[PDB]
Amino acid sequence: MNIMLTLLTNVTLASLLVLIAFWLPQLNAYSEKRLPFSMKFFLVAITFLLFDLEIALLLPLPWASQTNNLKTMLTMALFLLILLAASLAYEWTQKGLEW
Amino acid sequence: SRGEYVVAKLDDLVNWARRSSLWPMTFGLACCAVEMMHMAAPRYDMDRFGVVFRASPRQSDVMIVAGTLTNKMAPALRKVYDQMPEPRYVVSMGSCANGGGYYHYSYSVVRGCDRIVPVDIYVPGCPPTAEALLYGILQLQRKIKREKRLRIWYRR
Amino acid sequence: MFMINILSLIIPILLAVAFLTLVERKVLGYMQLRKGPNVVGPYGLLQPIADALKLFTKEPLRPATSSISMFIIAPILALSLALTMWVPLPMPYPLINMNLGVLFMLAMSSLAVYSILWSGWASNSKYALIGALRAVAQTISYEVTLAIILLSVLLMNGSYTLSTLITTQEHIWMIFTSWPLAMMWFISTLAETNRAPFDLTAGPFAMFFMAEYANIIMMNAFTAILFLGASHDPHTPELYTINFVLKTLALTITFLWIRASYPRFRYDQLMHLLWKSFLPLTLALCMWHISLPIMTASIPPQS
Amino acid sequence: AGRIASFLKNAWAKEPVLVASFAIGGLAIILPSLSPYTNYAIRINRATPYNYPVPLRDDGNMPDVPSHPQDPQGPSLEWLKNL
Amino acid sequence: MWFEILPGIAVMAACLFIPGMATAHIHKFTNGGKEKRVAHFSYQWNLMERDRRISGVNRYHVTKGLENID
Amino acid sequence: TYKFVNMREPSMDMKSVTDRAAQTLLWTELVRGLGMTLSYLFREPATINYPFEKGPLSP
Amino acid sequence: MPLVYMNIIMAFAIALAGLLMYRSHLMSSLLCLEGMMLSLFIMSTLIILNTHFTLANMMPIILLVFAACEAALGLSLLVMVSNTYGTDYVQNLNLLQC
Amino acid sequence: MTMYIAFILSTIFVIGFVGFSSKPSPIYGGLGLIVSGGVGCGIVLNFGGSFLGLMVFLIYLGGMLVVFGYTTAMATGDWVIYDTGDSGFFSEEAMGIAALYSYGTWLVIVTGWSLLIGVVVIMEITRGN
Numbered sequence: 001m002n003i004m005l006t007l008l009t010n011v012t013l014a015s016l017l018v019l020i021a022f023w024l025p026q027l028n029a030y031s032e033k034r035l036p037f038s039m040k041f042f043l044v045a046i047t048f049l050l051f052d053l054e055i056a057l058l059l060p061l062p063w064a065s066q067t068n069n070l071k072t073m074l075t076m077a078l079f080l081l082i083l084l085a086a087s088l089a090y091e092w093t094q095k096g097l098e099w
Numbered sequence: 100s101r102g103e104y105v106v107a108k109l110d111d112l113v114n115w116a117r118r119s120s121l122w123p124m125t126f127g128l129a130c131c132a133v134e135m136m137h138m139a140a141p142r143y144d145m146d147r148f149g150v151v152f153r154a155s156p157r158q159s160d161v162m163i164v165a166g167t168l169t170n171k172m173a174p175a176l177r178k179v180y181d182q183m184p185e186p187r188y189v190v191s192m193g194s195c196a197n198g199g200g201y202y203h204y205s206y207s208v209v210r211g212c213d214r215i216v217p218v219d220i221y222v223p224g225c226p227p228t229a230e231a232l233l234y235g236i237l238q239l240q241r242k243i244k245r246e247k248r249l250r251i252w253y254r255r
Numbered sequence: 256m257f258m259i260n261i262l263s264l265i266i267p268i269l270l271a272v273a274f275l276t277l278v279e280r281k282v283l284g285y286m287q288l289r290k291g292p293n294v295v296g297p298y299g300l301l302q303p304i305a306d307a308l309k310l311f312t313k314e315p316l317r318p319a320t321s322s323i324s325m326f327i328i329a330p331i332l333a334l335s336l337a338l339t340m341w342v343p344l345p346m347p348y349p350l351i352n353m354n355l356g357v358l359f360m361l362a363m364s365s366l367a368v369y370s371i372l373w374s375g376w377a378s379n380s381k382y383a384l385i386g387a388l389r390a391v392a393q394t395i396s397y398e399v400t401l402a403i404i405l406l407s408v409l410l411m412n413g414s415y416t417l418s419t420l421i422t423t424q425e426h427i428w429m430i431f432t433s434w435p436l437a438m439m440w441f442i443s444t445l446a447e448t449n450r451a452p453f454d455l456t457a458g459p460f461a462m463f464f465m466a467e468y469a470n471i472i473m474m475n476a477f478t479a480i481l482f483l484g485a486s487h488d489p490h491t492p493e494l495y496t497i498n499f500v501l502k503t504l505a506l507t508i509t510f511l512w513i514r515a516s517y518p519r520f521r522y523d524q525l526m527h528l529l530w531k532s533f534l535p536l537t538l539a540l541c542m543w544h545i546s547l548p549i550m551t552a553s554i555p556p557q558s
Numbered sequence: 559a560g561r562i563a564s565f566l567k568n569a570w571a572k573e574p575v576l577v578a579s580f581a582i583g584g585l586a587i588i589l590p591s592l593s594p595y596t597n598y599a600i601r602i603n604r605a606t607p608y609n610y611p612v613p614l615r616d617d618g619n620m621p622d623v624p625s626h627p628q629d630p631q632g633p634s635l636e637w638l639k640n641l
Numbered sequence: 642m643w644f645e646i647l648p649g650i651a652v653m654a655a656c657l658f659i660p661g662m663a664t665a666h667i668h669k670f671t672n673g674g675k676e677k678r679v680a681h682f683s684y685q686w687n688l689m690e691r692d693r694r695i696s697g698v699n700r701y702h703v704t705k706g707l708e709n710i711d
Numbered sequence: 712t713y714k715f716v717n718m719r720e721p722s723m724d725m726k727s728v729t730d731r732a733a734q735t736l737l738w739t740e741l742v743r744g745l746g747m748t749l750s751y752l753f754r755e756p757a758t759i760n761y762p763f764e765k766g767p768l769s770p
Numbered sequence: 771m772p773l774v775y776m777n778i779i780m781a782f783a784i785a786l787a788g789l790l791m792y793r794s795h796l797m798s799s800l801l802c803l804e805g806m807m808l809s810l811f812i813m814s815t816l817i818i819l820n821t822h823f824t825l826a827n828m829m830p831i832i833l834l835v836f837a838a839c840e841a842a843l844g845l846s847l848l849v850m851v852s853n854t855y856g857t858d859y860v861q862n863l864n865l866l867q868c
Numbered sequence: 869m870t871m872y873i874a875f876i877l878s879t880i881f882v883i884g885f886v887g888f889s890s891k892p893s894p895i896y897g898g899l900g901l902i903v904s905g906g907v908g909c910g911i912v913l914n915f916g917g918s919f920l921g922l923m924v925f926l927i928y929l930g931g932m933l934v935v936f937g938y939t940t941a942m943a944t945g946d947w948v949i950y951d952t953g954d955s956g957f958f959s960e961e962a963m964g965i966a967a968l969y970s971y972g973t974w975l976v977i978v979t980g981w982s983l984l985i986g987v988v989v990i991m992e993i994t995r996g997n
């Protein structure tokens with residue numbers, strides 16, 4: 001309720017400010033007179049998406065550190081980060097990060 | 100009455116706002132651009148008057164034509180002027196822009212930038228000193244201060 | 256009195272970003288052996304008001320053929336996100352006390368790119384579309400390392416609550432525990448807001464400017480809270496507010512300093528910078544900060 | 559031996575970021591298996607009571623189960639205090 | 642000189658002074674002179690609801706001491 | 712008479728390599744540039760107060 | 771089964787029908803697939819949270835990640851098709867036929 | 869009752885799906901999908917899944933639909949089913965999700981292998997030739 005009211009107020013303030021900005025200079029009369037598709041941009045977007053997925057996997061780490069299974073949790077976290085590094089290394093070596 | 104008092108004070112406020120922040124885009128055609136950059140230098144510091152350095156064409160109030168306008172260049176200058184939002188002002192700097200100057204009798208030079216766009220202030224000199232261009236900018240500010248739009252709207 | 260609190264959070268931020276333009280101009284001028292605006296207002300103070308009034312009275316250049324819907328939508332989203340990102344910040348008491356404040360900040364920052372995408376798309380220009388694509392790629396590339404560094408740092412805090420960051424830094428600052436992550440975070444925040452040396456790119460223009468400057472101030476405040484932990488005594492929070500504001504101001508002036516000091520990168524140069532220097536070190540330090548509390552038996556409390 | 563040292567010296571030049579990253583990652587992997595404080599961290603995690611300790615029904619055959627928290631029977635946290 | 646930059650900065654600081662300070666004062670005004678209660682984990686919420694029920698005025702911040710034990 | 716502007720050879724001993732790596736990983740020259748700009752901030756500007764002050768001229 | 775589950779299932783069905791309509795613009799096919807995934811995630815999260823099945827809270831995340839991977843795959847394929855024809859029109863895919 | 873706020877959110881979810889399933893001008897379909905995703909995240913957040921809702925809002929919207937829009941721009945009855953008891957001194961969804969590294973080792977292994985294979989697959993497919 002508080003957060004929804006805050007977001008509503010933010011949006012309303014922005015909308016009112018934009019409307020007055022667009023309509024204050026509209027009341028006064030005036031004169032009033034392709035293909036390329038670079039692939040590397042798509043590749044960097046896809047790499048960002050995959051790294052974002054691995055970040056999503058890494059996110060529960062702060063709570064993962066209180067489990068009484070510290071060896072297993074540490075091993076799995078290090079394995080996930082090692083796999084992230086391996087993905088980065090494979091993309092690096094196969095000329096995936098060039099321009 | 101209060102009806103004209105309100106529009107007079109609104110005119111004063113709007114004129115102060117418009118002249119207190121003039122954002123120029125400069126056509127650095129020739130040697131007068133050098134004196135423009137010297138007017139932007141630390142000694143004269145155009146920015147201290149609210150006149151920013153090298154604004155974008157879509158957000159510029161005043162156009163400074165500093166150099167010789169050739170026949171090959173006139174359409175580009177006219178297009179850039181047309182792209183500018185209103186209210187818009189033009190300052191003609193130097194003899195070349197004012198009337199052709201040293202190249203007046205030439206086959207490839209426009210005899211004055213006022214054949215293409217209307218001009219508000221003419222700054223004379225070959226080139227005008229940075230102080231001269233600053234004086235022209237302040238004269239344009241005074242000209243803006245003199246103007247009255249809400250009053251014209253009210254009495255019409 | 257919640258609406259009063261929301262307004263007292265929103266309006267002062269807008270005033271601060273209005274006068275940050277003046278501060279930047281004066282700082283750059285004095286670092287350039289000149290002055291900034293000193294004619295409008297006693298000390299150039301009335302310059303932002305004149306700028307705003309002139310901008311709001313100038314004819315707006317609608318493309319006359321582009322999508323009007325997105326042309327209006329982009330500034331709304333930009334400014335709404337810029338104002339929304341301020342609510343979880345504890346100074347020292349947050350307006351909205353979220354459990355996962357950090358994740359909400361990250362989500363809003365990720366949302367901030369739709370404004371760039373839509374503005375570039377609705378520019379109806381191929382060159383502006385290319386520029387928008389480059390900007391979006393840079394944004395996403397750097398928020399990757401932002402998120403990774405953020406989780407690595409928060410591993411020492413115990414949760415995603417920003418209020419707990421004050422308790423974590425009661426005795427020492429977080430800058431000492433991890434300065435390399437702090438340097439990388441600072442550079443990533445520079446690249447996030449499109450500030451030099453990463454600045455490769457009427458009314459709506461002013462509103463976009465307000466959104467960017469609010470994002471800059473917010474990012475510097477987030478850095479101050481995350482890495483420079485002020486001391487908060489519960490019986491006088493004004494001391495913490497003073498300290499936090501001073502640190503945020505110092506960081507923003509450091510942003511201006513950096514802008515005035517360096518040339519700018521190329522696109523491929525900053526792409527390579529990130530993907531070949533920050534990401535490997537970020538991963539290595541993430542592994543190190545996962546291992547360290549377990550190795551030293553210093554795991555933060557909350558779970 | 560000599561080849562490894564030469565390669566490391568050449569890598570520390572013109573590639574310092576990768577050398578630092580690999581060193582940090584290797585240390586992060588190796589050190590936990592050699593640290594003697596990790597068992598202390600596991601014990602600290604084991605000593606945090608999140609749930610209510612449900613009492614056991616006494617049947618006269620539990621000498622090691624305390625009848626009261628202040629009684630000496632049961633686990634002690636003197637080591638945690640000394641840490 | 643350089644101190645001519647100080648005024649604007651000062652103004653900016655004053656603006657950044659307003660939000661946080663305001664929040665604090667409001668949290669004092671709407672909570673009976675104390676900090677707003679932090680309620681995570683659903684146990685603190687249970688404590689707040691119990692306080693609201695036992696207050697007698699439907700306000701959690703109205704604390705009841707030993708004088709209410711009779 | 713001619714001069715060479717960029718004809719230097721870095722020393723390849725361990726100390727110099729470590730110094731270059733420290734410069735890379737700690738951004739020493741960047742702080743040097745920052746410090747020079749900071750020093751430039753704390754000196755008097757060269758701006759005159761036109762139109763109340765005028766630039767020097769000659770007969 | 772309350773109305774919220776019905777609404778999410780109906781949203782999934784609408785997204786499936788939109789995917790099967792295939793007016794044009796294979797990008798729209800991918801969008802409909804991902805709307806189907808979003809509905810699946812939403813109602814699976816509702817079911818798991820309602821029943822307080824703690825160990826199952828990991829299932830949505832996993833699903834999300836895997837589905838997003840597929841999107842990347844699909845996106846790549848889309849790009850390839852465009853690189854042959856210049857557009858992602860569905861009717862350009864008629865070289866192979868029954 | 870707030871006129872069945874959960875029902876209202878689900879209804880807006882349905883209208884968003886109807887709007888984007890018509891597939892008009894895929895940019896507009898992406899807009900409808902963004903609105904629907906925001907509404908669904910709101911549903912999850914209001915239900916009590918703060919972490920999963922924020923995961924929607926962050927991962928889905930900020931990365932995945934962003935990549936979708938980027939690629940596109942390149943081209944041409946409630947409240948009754950709720951529980952009664954409390955959670956304790958933690959949030960149950962956070963504990964269950966964190967159990968992925970202790971309980972769900974197999975899931976971590978298979979998901980990581982799938983993600984690395986997906987990186988390799990994307991690179992090979994995009995290699996061209």
Ligand SMILES: CCCCCCCCCCCCCCCCC[C@@H](O)O[C@H](CO[C@H](O)CCCCCCCCCCCCCCC)COP(=O)(O)OCC[N+](C)(C)C
Binds near residue numbers: 069075973974981
């Ligand atoms: C057996 C024959 C193997 C050869 C066949 C190869 C086929 C593929 C190999 C992949 C299968 C891996 C099997 C591992 C199964 C995981 C479960 C088992 O290991 O026990 C776990 C033990 O965890 C171990 O630490 C797992 C470590 C192994 C993972 C690290 C590397 C995995 C890489 C394998 C392939 C991935 C891609 C290729 C990389 C080179 C559980 O830990 P624990 O805490 O007691 O119990 C939790 C339950 N509690 C909470 C009630 C207590």
Ligand SMILES: CCCCCCCCCCCCCCCCC[C@@H](O)O[C@H](CO[C@H](O)CCCCCCCCCCCCCCC)COP(=O)(O)OCC[N+](C)(C)C
Binds near residue numbers: 112115301
């Ligand atoms: C709170 C609601 C906000 C809604 C919008 C309101 C906009 C903000 C209000 C604040 C306006 C600030 C005005 C301050 C201007 C004073 C500047 C003054 O010094 O100008 C001098 C006086 O000139 C004019 O007389 C000043 C006119 C300013 C406006 C007159 C009164 C307008 C008040 C009406 C406000 C009501 C607004 C209702 C609709 C929004 C001349 O200086 P100038 O020539 O430059 O420079 C010469 C340089 N020298 C001196 C170094 C050589």
Ligand SMILES: CCCCCCCC/C=C\CCCCCCCC(=O)O[C@H](COC(=O)CCCCCCC/C=C/CCCCCCCC)COP(=O)(O)OCCN
Binds near residue numbers: 538569584
């Ligand atoms: C075994 C531990 C695993 C965990 C740690 C890893 C954490 C993350 C680090 C890895 C991230 C990805 C790395 C990807 C590797 C790609 C390397 C590469 O291709 O770069 C080569 C060049 O780099 C190389 O030569 C390969 C790597 C060189 C060695 C790096 C360090 C190796 C180990 C050194 C430290 C060993 C341990 C420390 C010893 C000291 C005791 C503490 C080409 O560079 P370009 O910029 O494309 O071309 C130059 C012209 N533009």
Ligand SMILES: CCCCCCCC/C=C\CCCCCCCC(=O)O[C@H](COC(=O)CCCCCCC/C=C/CCCCCCCC)COP(=O)(O)OCCN
Binds near residue numbers: 517528578742
């Ligand atoms: C014994 C156990 C210890 C545990 C491990 C600790 C190891 C720590 C030692 C190493 C860590 C240092 C890493 C810190 C970050 C390094 C990143 C880096 O070096 O990148 C640079 C590049 O970095 C930059 O250039 C960024 C500059 C951006 C311009 C702005 C200047 C910023 C400086 C102003 C001050 C910064 C303030 C930082 C802290 C702020 C905190 C709020 C490399 O790029 P290139 O030189 O071009 O070469 C790469 C190709 N071979």
Ligand code: SF4
Binds near residue numbers: 195227
């Ligand atoms: S106006 Fe005079 S000084 Fe300026 S470019 Fe022309 S000839 Fe040179």
